[PDB]
Amino acid sequence: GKYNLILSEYLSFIYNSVQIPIYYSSNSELENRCIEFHSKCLENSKNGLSLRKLFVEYNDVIENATLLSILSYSYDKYNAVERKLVKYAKGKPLEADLTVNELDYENNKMTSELFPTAEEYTDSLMDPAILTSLSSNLNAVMFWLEKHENDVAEKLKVYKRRLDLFTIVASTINKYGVPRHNAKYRYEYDVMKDKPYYLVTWANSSIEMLMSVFSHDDYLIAKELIVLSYSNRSTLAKLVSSPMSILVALVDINGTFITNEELELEFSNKYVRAIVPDQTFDELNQMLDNMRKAGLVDIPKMIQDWLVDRSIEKFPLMAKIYSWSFHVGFRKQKMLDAALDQEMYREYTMLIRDEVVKMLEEPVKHDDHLLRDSELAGLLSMSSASNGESRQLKFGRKTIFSTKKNMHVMDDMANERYTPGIIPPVNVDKPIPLGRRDVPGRRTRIIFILPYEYFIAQHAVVEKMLIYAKHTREYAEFYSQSNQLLSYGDVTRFLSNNTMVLYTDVSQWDSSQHNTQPFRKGIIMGLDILANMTNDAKVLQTLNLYKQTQINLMDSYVQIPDGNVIKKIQYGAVASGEKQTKAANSIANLALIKTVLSRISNKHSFATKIIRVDGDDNYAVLQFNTEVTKQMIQDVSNDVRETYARMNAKVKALVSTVGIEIAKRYIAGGKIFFRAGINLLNNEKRGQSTQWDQAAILYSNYIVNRLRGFETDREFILTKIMQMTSVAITGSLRLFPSERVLTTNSTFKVFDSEDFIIEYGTTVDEVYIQRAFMSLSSQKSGIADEIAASSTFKNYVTRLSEQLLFSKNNIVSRGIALTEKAKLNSYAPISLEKRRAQISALLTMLQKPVTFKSSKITINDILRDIKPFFTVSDAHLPIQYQKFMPTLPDNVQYIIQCIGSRTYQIEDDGSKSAISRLISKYSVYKPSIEELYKVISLHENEIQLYLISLGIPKIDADTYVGSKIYSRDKYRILESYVYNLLSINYGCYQLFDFNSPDLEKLIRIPFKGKIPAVTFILHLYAKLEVINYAIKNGSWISLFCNYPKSEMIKLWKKMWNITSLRSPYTNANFFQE
RNA sequence: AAGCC
Fold first, then answer.
1. In which domain, by residue range, is A676 found?
2. Which nucleotides along chain B are within 7 A of a protein C-beta?
């Protein structure tokens, strides 16, 4: 409950010249007491009188009522920041070295010197793009420094390391003053022109870095990155994190985890000798020297010290540095520069063509319905993103403009213009609009924003391709329900003294122009083979249309802004934006590795233990008939690099016998590692989410980094949350939501009261609040209702429905209309109306929590019912599993050591149910987990009608509605829905093996009947309760269940009426991946 | 005013 205490200290620290705590209670008499107390406090404040007597008087309210919020009456003028900063601003400011960056605009020049006029200005290259100010971040850092001013021992050292660093940020900022933000949290030209262009983004990156500093090493790293970053805005992250690829190869393997036949992690005490050719050492040295020529000193020395022995025990430092470099900020170049960088492919094209054929052979020969109704599938799938141009659109009686894809398809259909048979050109006549993608350390990449003709023509086919991958192991990213742990396991499996791993980063090749000819031609050749496999008109046309998109793309043109102009240039490289981006890219990368390996063997004889393509990297494990030597590694490597070289591909190809390093993960010393480089106080791009959504995201970001190895002080994260979640009533009246409002599992949840532990209402007041918040979950939108009433809209919904089903509509029809009414949320005007409605409802709710007819059941109510029937008892579980993911915090790591981990994702969509499969065989429709859940619980007769209404034949519908499988599905769908409501696949839980035998002993559940749903919930609730206790206490407990039989029948009814909750916290997990 | 997932 320390969040509430922390908030007051911060408010008291920020404002000095009152605070009015607002309480509430589920009990009527107590609530009046809360009402009386609130009234007295306002009256006393409106008279400059002490509130000390009132607190004593309403001691009961403070003691038993629940704090709902805090009122902030501050009569200053959002200043203080300027005044506060000077005490810390004593060190000498920093001076930008305007000679470190190639492109002139990447150097820290004075804003004016880059944009002499207010019309030439743009924040596009330094916009933090986040809904929180620089001034607030500064305020947060100072507040923390004051609190830990009188600290001692080691805590003091942490403060001292931080105070030093913040001084650099302060001193430099003061020389120009603090950049003031506008309503939309942007930094305009007038504020900007006096100060160094990159001032604000740099301060945000530095503050974020320094507040994540604890050990002396963190301090050394933060200081170097902070100083270097101010001048270097283009190669510092790449230079800092580049030695990692060499390093993984060095460390020896002394016992690691592998994958067994059951596709699960299993410990293997084996030893693998890290074999490294002298050449590799020179390459590593060149990297270290390069870091050195760039001003770096402390960071290069640390790698050098580590290099004497190369102990996986002192490796955490190397990992720490790699995670750290990403926090310098994003590299945001100019669209044109990002764009500008851009006979023996016979084997490579053939493999791509053959791979394309396998993924569709069976679907095509049979005459799969999804291929036949491909157009329909694309329409249902259609998002609400950009189509490219901002068209003028008339709805009902309203003339408005939008770039949205959904809006464009509807308007075009209502005007006979909708024509997916004609795949628009993307050449010089119709240049492709461009989108961008920014990432720290690496260079900016462009994105094709193609017209919806392309998405529809590609959506059915890509989906078939994905399914083929789903059961193909070479495709790491798509195989089964597999998580990264299984991939880590596979590489280790075959590592021995007579095998060498081959990892290669092919990100550069995908964007190469050399690549585009063999790529499109390979898919097209494959498409032709597929066409000669059937005669189906629907299959050929859908298949043909896909062929057309590849041909149009072969020669595309792009609209690259060059100031305030839009130069049209000829783009001959494969950018991404298509539906087939990831699947096609996966096919090409895999095709490429196979091509290289095939060429190399003519020389050396090895065995292909495993081959893989995972995103922008691909790798293989080879086995030789003899023992591997340093000389052998150099020879295999030179030949592989040379093979890549002949194909004119710029790629990083390395060879080791112990580790690998790819964009997603890296395996050093038999242990798995994941870069913790998610930026906190700077975003890639601006979206349409709110401050609350953003606060939840920052917390989520904090949780992922913390798990991965980078920890930002929680008090700082909490401070950020208080600023972001606040709401202004007026100009001097600010309202700050309480801990209870913020953490309770509601539609307004932003973070968990305790990291890695999700709590659910177990008290009446919590329940009262939870019910009240839901009462105002969805708000109305006038603009949205209008269009929901417009002809063009209803016809679009009607047109889709009359094409999908045969018999009758409504459970399906009601759903299609909403799904569409939702896609209007991308349209700002509608989104804006919703936020305004939410704030007013929220302001009133915090003020005096309303009523509610409840009558709605959720996950929390079901849990609350169970709790009282469990008897806890101290138990003990020994640690039996060695650590494979070294960076995990100590409490999370302990759960894994005792119960183990998993290598899969728990089915939380219900796609593995027979009914979902049946719908798939005959319908292009895709019911959600929630829809399936409502449908399975319907009366036998209703289910039969719904299946038929979707095109399912009678013999099949009739057979299922009675069968054993239908009864079984019922349980499976509920299990899937329940797992989904409990976030068993996210955060910390996704790691734990919930079916651990060790975990199972701790649960003692005697059967007093035999009714699946009830047995499953009790066991799950017990596993979660035991694990949460373990996470917080480091010790275990045994749970006994004495749940009545009369009770279970009541509970089972309760279960088939659970409502799903939507919230920033919920959105944040979805947002992560 | 920012495509696949």
1. 251-275+476-505+581-682
2. 1-5
